[PDB]
Design a protein around this ligand. Structure first.
Ligand SMILES: CCCCCCCCCCCCCCCC(=O)O
Length: 131
């Protein structure tokens, strides 16, 4: 259902994924301890993504399958979409300076939303305990 708050607690491979994006020390560290409180809010076709992380309290929002352009803090351009496979939400995010591709598997269990993250061959699970 998604509809609700999320607050990452434990991760799983997320440290190495930042080494992939080209993040060194403080950046991947700040990305981890961020406290990404996601306040998911589905209206109908759009999915707001409140993100009270260390970077900024920015609602994201991304109509399912609507290719958009989202600048990151240290990741830069990331254009791509999210689509409900039926059982998982997949955050496909390419880049403008090259057009490769990054993906993101939102594996909701029940009480936890895990968002993996691959920019090729380095996953990064960001376990959320909802709330
Ligand atoms: C330099 C590190 C910053 C990147 C990682 C922490 C902040 C997240 C960046 C934007 C992600 C939000 C847009 C997609 C929604 C999501 O991540 O679930």
């Amino acid at each position: 259902a998604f509809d609700g708050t999320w607050k990452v607690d434990r991760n799983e491979n997320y440290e190495k994924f930042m080494e992939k994006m080209g993040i060194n020390v403080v950046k991947r560290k700040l990305g981890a301890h961020d406290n990404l409180k996601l306040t998911i809010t589905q209206e109908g076709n759009k999915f707001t993504v409140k993100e009270s992380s260390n970077f900024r309290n920015i609602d994201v929002v991304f109509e399912l399958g609507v290719d958009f352009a989202y600048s990151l803090a240290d990741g830069t351009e990331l254009t791509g979409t999210w689509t409900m496979e039926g059982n998982k939400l997949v955050g496909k995010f390419k880049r403008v300076d090259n057009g490769k591709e990054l993906i993101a598997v939102r594996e909701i269990s029940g009480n936890e939303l895990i968002q993996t993250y691959t920019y090729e061959g380095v996953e990064a699970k960001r376990i959320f305990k909802k709330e």
